[PDB]
């Protein structure tokens, strides 16, 4: 009636979907990053533009694949924002965040398994503050970048349709992927662009440097604030539902 449990099984398949999607996200995107960076021929890579596309377009693809199954978060800040507005229950939120973090670690681990030399040599796909910017600028860049993203996800929620056996709204994947694309064009030079604690974490775990670990709180704090401000903006100021 729910007698089948149903549901349950749907909940755990959602967690798996978010685990595998975040793995694919990090594999494809960090492989792109390392592939660009190891390139010897000047203008012989996909460029920073290709990297930006890999991040936005994989979000587009992955949210498309997972919207109806898990709600398609692929991103602890997105889950956190939706949690705050009560579109995600606390247990699912935490399970999604763990799934995403674990998926991200595996995805980056795979890139490193495939091209260990250039992976270590060229920065591990990790986020950190680039030379010429301070921590406050980096944090502000991450807050506002995640705000664009989570503002987009809220505007992209279906108020009638939900992920399977849940009340997690279905998301329109394209505007969300484009938001990620745009924020990369702006934020790559500053931090590489985080806007996704799982993506930053997965890379910090595998690359394992003190420099990167020191900057890592930015990539949790910035996005969670950006996400919280988007949630409040959408739900309370625009009201908006």
């Amino acid at each position: 009636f729910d007698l089948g449990e149903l549901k349950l099984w749907s909940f755990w398949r959602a967690a798996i979907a978010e685990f595998i999607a975040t793995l694919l996200f990090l594999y494809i995107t960090v492989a792109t990053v390392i592939g660009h960076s190891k390139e010897t021929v000047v203008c012989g890579s996909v460029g920073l533009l290709g990297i930006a596309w890999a991040f936005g377009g994989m979000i587009f693809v992955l949210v498309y694949c997972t919207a109806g199954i898990s709600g398609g978060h692929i991103n602890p800040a997105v889950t956190f924002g939706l949690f705050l507005a009560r579109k995600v229950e606390l247990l699912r939120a935490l399970v999604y965040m763990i799934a995403q973090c674990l998926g991200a670690i595996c995805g980056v681990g795979l890139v490193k398994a495939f091209m260990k030399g250039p992976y270590n040599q060229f920065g591990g796909g990790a986020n950190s503050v680039a030379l010429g910017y301070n921590k406050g600028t980096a944090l502000g860049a991450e807050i506002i970048g995640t705000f664009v993203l989570v503002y987009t996800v809220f505007s992209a929620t279906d108020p009638k349709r939900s992920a399977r056996d849940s009340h997690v709204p279905i998301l329109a994947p394209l505007p969300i992927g484009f938001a990620v694309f745009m924020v990369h064009l702006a934020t790559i030079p500053i931090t590489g662009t985080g806007i996704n604690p799982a993506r930053s974490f997965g890379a910090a775990v595998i690359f394992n440097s003190n420099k990167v670990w020191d900057d890592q709180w930015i990539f949790w704090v910035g996005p969670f604030i950006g996400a919280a401000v988007a949630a409040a903006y959408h739900q309370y100021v625009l009201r908006a539902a």
Copy 2:
């Protein structure tokens, strides 16, 4: 019945939506511009192509987020065009234009707060006529570029659906974002591409140079004419509604 006021509150949330959207537009786009320009490595930026994408794609994203709330103008020329055809009442028009101008100033102000050195050094994201072109060419480039844009918005209007508690038509965001993209590919070398008085103004205000301020009337006059000609073309010649 309207007893709730309703409406009113919708009107002011629309103004806020247009304020915040235009802020996000200028922040993301001018951060992209300054990020590209400050780059020391040849072919190590997102390129002029990435800039063009930042402008079109943020229009796509922002019109998507705001279509149902404000009508998604993000641009005084767009509001002016729709005003002329009576799809926007005069008070809303003026309120939107002020909101957009204010949002633009804040968005550019933020880029400058984050990277003040490269912001001043590399042109402030401002529009002005590039060397090799005259004022008439620059003005013609802006008229015709805004005409493509506003012609697209008119063709993208929903004749049945309107923004919340208003008669401002809902807009299809993608063709509009693509129109902005295309016009940048053509007009970046000439003026940087304005086609948006709020975007040109916000940057002139923050960057504050006599060179830029001298060229600024182009970026109001060109787009308002382009917008007026699109409105007349759509409503009167194609008839079209």
Copy 3:
């Protein structure tokens, strides 16, 4: 009942729509081309990729704007293909082709008015066979490129919905714009990519060189054959309607 004439007026507004759309197409695209070519800074233009995007994306935008008004051809080969399959009556076909040719001339004329020096210096946006290819290769490249395009338009026809007061099918603009994009990626090095007699003609007229005029039959013959083969393929072999 038709008593209003109706219709008529719709027919002539369709011709105007195709005139203005093809003007916008050539202006935006050839301005992009000349802007890229005149650039002194290595990797400081939108690149051949940006050019390819200007052509596909303006087709996307323009077919979107004009689909419901004229059927959105913007291209004598497209009109010819649809004529052959009886989706366009002969008088409209010829009127569209003239409108498109005239629009193209004006669009290129405008680019030249705006940047006459770099316009003449850098090839006028004209199509011709590049060094290293023969005429048969150029013609085969144009046949097959137009075949992709017109095959896409046929697959993108709405069998139930037509342009205003006509039986010219409505077209889905995006796949068509993408087809143009893809064919440019392949054919730019060979001919610059024609796949559109009006686009090739408009540029030959304004640029006015013997070299270009000598190659011009390729850009009528190739696309008309490509279009005829697509029509036969769709209607007769796939059957398909």
Copy 4:
């Protein structure tokens, strides 16, 4: 009733559709590749980014054209994945795979007919393992790349609508084209990206080198495994239908 045969004729038109689509895919994409590679001017080609776009965007276009006619596979791994999940009958599967392989050979043959010198000089559009990677890395890159692709196709299946006179599901073309795009951004530096046995085979046949033929099993085995794992993941783990 089926009395007309109907059906039959639909089956053989589907095979033709998959033959011609895969021909167009290889022609446009390998012409792009050779056009980029033969370019003498540094940053004067469409770049690796343009190549990646040619592959994803032609998949988008071609699946769009053929979805309703054949199901739009254009790719033996896609057909194999859908076969395994019983969405394609065995005879159609084998006929599609042969059609695709034959189409691919012709498409590459045409590129070579048009630019034989640069075609041989610059690698023939063939896939093989690049210097710096081993066979296991190349194979893992192909498994996981095809997994993204076929996972996307499964998520993009219409459970109610099928290709003409068949039970082959209709596919949403855009997410599929984007998946191909993304996988190229990541896998071009490793193998050139195969993820399509017909595409790898067609190029090996025409280019005919021992180096390439030695690596060719990777481009059958990787994609068939990636496809089988996606099928199992979608049908059995996500369940998912």
